[PDB]
């Protein structure tokens, strides 16, 4: 999708945990994940505890991308939900779309992606670190 | 003699150690009634101590100022009862063990399940190699001359350097 | 009839076929070894039945049969003590004089000069001195003859064979179903009544009919060979009435509720027997009767086939409050569907019980002439401390295993487990603050005392001649216990134990038990104990609570219970698993138990154990130096370790030389542990590659490729070596010290 | 931020992308193997460096390589 | 300490302490500039090794000086 | 006793030389990590993959040989 | 007399470890394989496995034998 | 080289450098490493085969 997030999506019913985001989420960086459910059931939170996911649409704020992707892995390998979307909320109310970027999962091939970081030789043909001395660059 | 050492048969401190060793067990002996197996065990200990000291005196060992035997690992012929003859004995036995292990390794490599032949030993074949490793200095020399003992060197894996 | 026996017939065929197929229990290891890691994985996964089968019924059957095999091993271990007492001991000569003959039931073979270990233990016998206390245990049962020990050993062998047969039978012939094991109410009733209460009742019967008359005759001065045999005492009301003049009335006062007529052999006199320095055996028999009645009464609580009784599901679900949400709901299913939770509870209870046994058997010597046998007391205390510490670490280990594997969020929503997991940072933070506060205070008082004594300022110390820290609460509790007989124990003749104050008890010069005075050093070392226990609790509780997830790693439960790390990422995720938390907490358990047993040894050698002469002149072993030397770390180092290692370092050439050998070897093993504990796998793998090059050059490459030990295995090997070396050094030091003084 | 590189010994078996917990890797089309795809690292600023991709590579001496470098609040995995 | 215990245990402990400082009154007004993290792996090995060496030297020097001084021979 | 302790000293020298020479010669790479020169002289590890790579750099070889130097000097 | 000897021996151990550490650093980021083609320095890396294995043999032999003699005397 | 040949690996960063393996399949296409070689010794991850180029194999025995 695009960089838009519905702030009024209902949240899973949770009793409050001591694992939530700290002061540096309203200051630096915050993440949210939204998914669609078919029934009311109980899932384990990545910040400990258990929460009931609402039937319909859900929204949940986390502190790092690892927590959102671990929750997405739980929503995949368990009871099948595969339309989750992970965002990144800045303190100036600016949202950025991260997971399912091109609309499809990264493991499936998608025409229109550009290879980044690809190297045109085997790993044993990197230059020696003597040849990059006093240059600032590296042999990667 | 060598290094200022005296023979243990001609050393007074060795005899003093003999007397102290037998006197400690004799003092331990005085609280037991005769004929009891404790008394027999203690007098057997006394006899064993006397026999050990007499053997150390008779074998030609050299004792120092502390009255203890000192081994000369020099290689002199008169001290070949020290290091050199046990050296030859251990070298023969260790080569026996190594050649038996190597022969069974070759056999287990040449089979269909090399892994299962090493956790579960083929006992008849293992006993065969184990007993046939008695002529290891000749078989190893024959394999060295035939070029089967050593890999050329371009066929063993090596780190990139 | 809901509670019933349902049993499968011939589930598993008895065959020597999977014996020749190692690693058959798991899917991965059954395909054969490729490297030398399949061996260690085979050894590590042998008893992990939860990873071998997904069926709880087969897991329970394996557990039951393994319990039978363990009980067979324990029966063989009882039989060894009885047989060595029968055939290889000086138990008769010890019975004729249990104050100058040293117990010994272990003789060595003379082959290599090791016959010097057969020391002069007295009674015309040569052997290794025994600190197990089995001799006093047999004397407390009336086993004055050496035939009864032999037949007890034979019966133990028969029972071990019975347990082996039962273990084969219940896994290969008649394996119970899952519904049999889940009858926890029936199991609880049957254990509480038939095991505990009937064992207490039968042991009280044996005590009353055998050990009371035999020990009374022994304390009267009758030699053991002129004492009536126990079968001659069992059916002789005339002889028992001669000894205890209440058997004339027979069993009639028992049924008429005139139990006061049985006060000749069922007493509550308390204190210690002056002849033996132990508890009165009439008190012991009365104690076992009270326990038997209490346990049989308690075994009638839970519901079975008949309508009376409790359901444990209804008791738990009724206990809930405002601050805890749903309360104990869902714990019944947790404890009836998981074995790891039951381990996590039972191991904690058994470790705490062993520690309680250690604290109770020194101040209340229960066996005759065991108080004046100082090596026995020291060995039993230190033994039960180490067993308790190991079990209390294992409880946290299995709690972590349950949390990783058997936890379910749908089952345990908003109950006590969920609420604990939802605020674990607060728990760990506050316990961290308590650990820091206790450590700074308890250890910095020692360091401050070191600095003041080194600076020549003894008036600024924390001592009794200086700024005082008197344990006023412990002294008040001691004064309350000393005034208990008559006031708050009105039908009591003496105090519960003389450690709370009272009279010195002496048996043939040696001190059995005397009052233990508490000063500022005792306050300091008790705070040290509290701090060490708190840090061990912090490590283990943090491992249990953060076993599933944390802020660092959100998906720690998907990695397993034990795993080395999650890479060098996030700055480094080394030792994040709950297994590594148990590995770290075992060291702190070792530290805590070592300090506890050091405190016990020094305080008992300094203020309790010793000799008495004319006009009550008390001379202790070390001279009462604990009050002024246990205030500094230098005082500990100089006056405990350096001063009491003289016995273990000068034991060469005597009967205690094995203790010096084990001292040196345990130092070697403890130092050998740091090789695994400090280093890492990759260096050893590269060194193994360099060795494999030479092997490949000489056509000596094994098909099972040699690999370095894994990271978890390297940590486990280092920890096991560390614990073995430490416990061996302390074992040899204690035994060589206390045998020789 | 760490730097992730994928070399041409890739076989396109996708295990590195599945093993990634931070959505760093993705599959782009390619013609150098039978699967017709090569791994790519377009979001290396979200790399934490846990090297789960390098554990999942089946090729002899892994094609996807993570070099630990500068540390930020994302590569350190800090929630505070 | 640093030679046997490794980063993960200490990083989780630091995170709990960070929550403790951020969520207590009065003291949460005092705010750090650098986010507290556990020592890195190589840094931990260096610190433990430096501790090992300094303790080694400072426990052998007093012995080799005082034992010779305490005997004069 | 001089004979035995001289043999102990030779043991210490040879083992410290073993650790240091192995680190120096495997600093550029080994079978477990053929591209060790790309990661520098000092780095934590290469992850838990392919068995585990604790203490794999040459700096870790220095760190291991420091203990052996202290032992033999003692 | 005691302090000066222990002083200089510990400093000798430190300098000895540092020399090998800097040789490892030189191998990591200063050694040019094309400049040292078939050199006396590259041949050291050519047969490094033999060197490490023989240091392993000497260290294991010395440790086995001197510890066995010491434990025998004990 | 052909399918079933015995080859020696010349790739220096490979686990089986200067080691003998068996060719399993030679792909005919645009693959940069078409030859599949299977080995009797697993590496540190435990993987037996690997894809190799035609210039990285020295050949030992014909099918
Ligand atoms: C019979 C098998 C065998 C043989 C011939 C060798 C031969 C050799 N090993 Mg060796 N080794 C073996 C087994 C064997 N090893 C095993 C099982 C281990 C693991 C514990 C090692 C660990 C090892 C190391 C760590 C080192 C050597 C080294 C060496 C070389 C120098 C000699 C030495 O140090 O011996 C010392 C040998 C040992 C300490 C291990 C002995 C273990 C037992 C006693 C031998 C195995 C016998 C086997 C079970 C017999 C079963 C066969 C039967 C069914 C017929 C030499 C090429 C050194 C080297 O590279 O020098 C160039 C070196 O540093 N080895
Ligand atoms: C009154 C009946 C009774 C008794 C005495 C026991 C006793 C025992 N059960 Mg048990 N159990 C019972 C009923 C009973 N159970 C019922 C009804 C169930 C089903 C709900 C179970 C289910 C159960 C399980 C699942 C397990 C046990 C286990 C155990 C043992 C615990 C280990 C221990 O304390 O060692 C104490 C050791 C002894 C006391 C030694 C004596 C051993 C014998 C077998 C005890 C009985 C002897 C006999 C009846 C008395 C004869 C008296 C005669 C001399 C006059 C112990 C032997 C555990 C075990 O170890 O398995 C083997 C275990 O895993 N039980
Ligand atoms: C399991 C434990 C146990 C066992 C096997 C026995 C067994 C026995 N007791 Mg006994 N007893 C016990 C516990 C036990 N007691 C306890 C706990 C007490 C304390 C209250 C007593 C107090 C007691 C007295 C005071 C007497 C016995 C007597 C007897 C014997 C005859 C009783 C009989 O069978 O009458 C038939 C059974 C019934 C009528 C029921 C018999 C050997 C008598 C005796 O000495 O016999 C020689 C006797 O006078 N008992
Ligand atoms: C009631 C006791 C009890 C029981 C039934 C279990 C049962 C279990 N534990 Mg456990 N544990 C216990 C007590 C117990 N533990 C205690 C007290 C501790 C604290 C130390 C632990 C710590 C612990 C850990 C940390 C782990 C387990 C694991 C396991 C499981 C697999 C064990 C296995 O396969 O090992 C097979 C058995 C062996 C490999 C034998 C071990 C031999 C020891 C290390 C050496 C003993 C030396 C000896 C005493 C003296 C030698 C002297 C020398 C001179 C020769 C299994 C369910 C593991 C698991 O994955 O659980 C799911 C696991 O990771 N446990
Ligand atoms: C003698 C060695 C030693 C010492 C001093 C410590 C000290 C500590 N360890 Mg520990 N540890 C050690 C060995 C040691 N460990 C080993 C070998 C291991 C490996 C198994 C571990 C594993 C380990 C774990 C796993 C944990 C600890 C924890 C702790 C801390 C407990 C909290 C506390 O009371 O701190 C207070 C400080 C002290 C007790 C020591 C100093 C006391 C001084 C004398 C008084 C105060 C001085 C003051 C602060 C500074 C003034 C002087 C200055 C101005 C110059 C503390 C820092 C725990 C922790 O940090 O959680 C709270 C924890 O979880 N350690
Ligand atoms: C003439 C001698 C000499 C010189 C010029 C250098 C120079 C250098 N070394 Mg070096 N080194 C030396 C001797 C020397 N070393 C010796 C003898 C050893 C063996 C112990 C080492 C081991 C060594 C290693 C392992 C490494 C270096 C590195 C370096 C380079 C960077 C230095 C750096 O970052 O440190 C900056 C300064 C510090 C880190 C200060 C740390 C303070 C130390 C730990 C002592 C602190 C303990 C303190 C005294 C305790 C007080 C006790 C009190 C409380 C009682 C630099 C080129 C590093 C490098 O860049 O290589 C690629 C590197 O990795 N060296
Ligand atoms: C007292 C503690 C201790 C001991 C004994 C050792 C022992 C050893 N370390 Mg070591 N190490 C330690 C602490 C210790 N380390 C610490 C704290 C560190 C810091 C992390 C290291 C770091 C370290 C490194 C980095 C290296 C070693 C190496 C070695 C080996 C040197 C070769 C040797 O002496 O073989 C002798 C073997 C022994 C002393 C082990 C005991 C074997 C048995 C029990 C001896 C019994 C005597 C007699 C033969 C019995 C007959 C056997 C019978 C079956 C017939 C050896 C296994 C080096 C190595 O592996 O090279 C080969 C190596 O590279 N260690
Ligand atoms: C040492 C040992 C041993 C032995 C043991 C024994 C010897 C045991 C015994 C046991 C016994 C010998 C037991 C018994 C028991 C009994 C009982 C337990 C009884 C009960 C009774 C009752 C309970 C009663 C009731 C009643 C009443 C009161 C009323 C009503 C009626 C009637 C009568 C019913 C062995 C060898 C094994 C091994 C080793 C160790
Ligand atoms: C006259 C005399 C004599 C002789 C003497 C001599 C001849 C001696 C020598 C000695 C020697 C001869 C010594 C040596 C030593 C050596 C060493 C000690 C070495 C070391 C090395 C190192 C440390 C290395 C380093 C490095 C690296 C690692 C890498 C590369 C670079 C470098 C080089 C930096 C006699 C005895 C007859 C007697 C009389 C007198
Ligand atoms: C005269 C003498 C002496 C000296 C000695 C010496 C100096 C020696 C040297 C020696 C040497 C300088 C040696 C070298 C060597 C080299 C080599 C190179 C070797 C090799 C070997 C091998 C190769 C083996 C193999 C095998 C076999 C054949 C058997 C077993 C198995 C195996 C495969 C392992 C002394 C004074 C002590 C004493 C007196 C006498
Ligand atoms: C030495 C060491 C190794 C190498 C250790 C290995 C390969 C263990 C070898 C096991 C042997 C083969 C078992 C038998 C030992 C001897 C053959 C028998 C000795 C018997 C004595 C009682 C005399 C690691 O793999 C390792 C991994 C992680 C952290 C630290 C370390 C570590 O310190
Ligand atoms: S796991 Fe490795 S080989 Fe497979 S697609 Fe990813 S980078 Fe390529
Ligand atoms: S290091 Fe971790 S986050 Fe980065 S690409 Fe590899 S698996 Fe993904
Ligand atoms: S155990 Fe080794 S590989 Fe794992 S994080 Fe620690 S240093 Fe890295």
Curated annotation (Swiss-Prot), chain C:
SS bond partners: none
Gene Ontology molecular function, alphabetical: 4 iron, 4 sulfur cluster binding; chlorophyll binding; electron transfer activity; magnesium ion binding; oxidoreductase activity
InterPro entries recorded: PSI_PsaA (IPR006243), PSI_PsaA/B (IPR001280), PSI_PsaA/B_CS (IPR020586), PSI_PsaA/B_sf (IPR036408)
Signal peptide: none
Annotated positions binding chlorophyll a': 667
Source species of the chain: Emiliania huxleyi (Coccolithophore)
E.C. designation(s): 1.97.1.12
Residues reported to bind [4Fe-4S] cluster: 565, 574
Protein origin, superkingdom: Eukaryota
Cited function: PsaA and PsaB bind P700, the primary electron donor of photosystem I (PSI), as well as the electron acceptors A0, A1 and FX. PSI is a plastocyanin/cytochrome c6-ferredoxin oxidoreductase, converting photonic excitation into a charge separation, which transfers an electron from the donor P700 chlorophyll pair to the spectroscopically characterized acceptors A0, A1, FX, FA and FB in turn. Oxidized P700 is reduced on the lumenal side of the thylakoid membrane by plastocyanin or cytochrome c6.
Membrane topology: Multi-pass membrane protein
Cofactor binding summary note: P700 is a chlorophyll a/chlorophyll a' dimer, A0 is one or more chlorophyll a, A1 is one or both phylloquinones and FX is a shared 4Fe-4S iron-sulfur center.
Localization, UniProt: Plastid, Chloroplast thylakoid membrane
Name under which the protein is recorded: Photosystem I P700 chlorophyll a apoprotein A1
Curated annotation (Swiss-Prot), chain D:
Record field: catalytic activity: reduced [plastocyanin] + hnu + oxidized [2Fe-2S]-[ferredoxin] = oxidized [plastocyanin] + reduced [2Fe-2S]-[ferredoxin]
GO cellular component: a single term: chloroplast thylakoid membrane
Binding site for [4Fe-4S] cluster 2: 20, 47, 50, 53
Gene designation per UniProt: psaC
Cofactor note (record): Binds 2 [4Fe-4S] clusters. Cluster 2 is most probably the spectroscopically characterized electron acceptor FA and cluster 1 is most probably FB.
Database matches in NCBIfam families: PS_I_psaC
PANTHER family membership: PHOTOSYSTEM I IRON-SULFUR CENTER, PHOTOSYSTEM I IRON-SULFUR CENTER-RELATED
Name of the protein in question: Photosystem I iron-sulfur center
EC number: 1.97.1.12
MF term (GO), any: 4 iron, 4 sulfur cluster binding
Source species: Emiliania huxleyi
BP GO annotations: photosynthetic electron transport in photosystem I
Stored InterPro entries: 4Fe4S_Fe-S-bd (IPR017896), 4Fe4S_Fe_S_CS (IPR017900), PSI_iron-sulfur_center (IPR050157), PSI_PsaC (IPR017491)
Domain 4Fe-4S ferredoxin-type residues, every copy: 1-30, 38-67
This protein's UniProt keywords: 4Fe-4S, Chloroplast, Electron transport, Iron, Iron-sulfur, Membrane, Metal-binding, Oxidoreductase, Photosynthesis, Photosystem I, Plastid, Repeat, Thylakoid, Transport
Chain sites annotated for binding [4Fe-4S] cluster 1: 10, 13, 16, 57
Thylakoid listed as a keyword: yes
Membrane topology: Peripheral membrane protein
Compartment annotation: Plastid, Chloroplast thylakoid membrane
Superkingdom of the source species: Eukaryota
UniProt function note: Apoprotein for the two 4Fe-4S centers FA and FB of photosystem I (PSI); essential for photochemical activity. FB is the terminal electron acceptor of PSI, donating electrons to ferredoxin. The C-terminus interacts with PsaA/B/D and helps assemble the protein into the PSI complex. Required for binding of PsaD and PsaE to PSI. PSI is a plastocyanin/cytochrome c6-ferredoxin oxidoreductase, converting photonic excitation into a charge separation, which transfers an electron from the donor P700 chlorophyll pair to the spectroscopically characterized acceptors A0, A1, FX, FA and FB in turn.
Subunit structure, as described in the record: The eukaryotic PSI reaction center is composed of at least 11 subunits.
Cofactor: [4Fe-4S] cluster
UniProtKB/Swiss-Prot annotation, chain F:
Spans through the membrane: 3-21, 61-74
Cystine pairings recorded for this chain: none
Subcellular location: Plastid, Chloroplast thylakoid membrane
Binding residues for [4Fe-4S] cluster: 45, 54
Family: Belongs to the PsaA/PsaB family.
Quaternary structure (record): The PsaA/B heterodimer binds the P700 chlorophyll special pair and subsequent electron acceptors. PSI consists of a core antenna complex that captures photons, and an electron transfer chain that converts photonic excitation into a charge separation. The eukaryotic PSI reaction center is composed of at least 11 subunits.
Purpose of the protein: PsaA and PsaB bind P700, the primary electron donor of photosystem I (PSI), as well as the electron acceptors A0, A1 and FX. PSI is a plastocyanin/cytochrome c6-ferredoxin oxidoreductase, converting photonic excitation into a charge separation, which transfers an electron from the donor P700 chlorophyll pair to the spectroscopically characterized acceptors A0, A1, FX, FA and FB in turn. Oxidized P700 is reduced on the lumenal side of the thylakoid membrane by plastocyanin or cytochrome c6.
Name the UniProt record assigns to this protein: Photosystem I P700 chlorophyll a apoprotein A2
Source organism (scientific name): Emiliania huxleyi (Coccolithophore)
Gene giving rise to this polypeptide: psaB
Residues of the full protein shown: 515 to 588 of 734
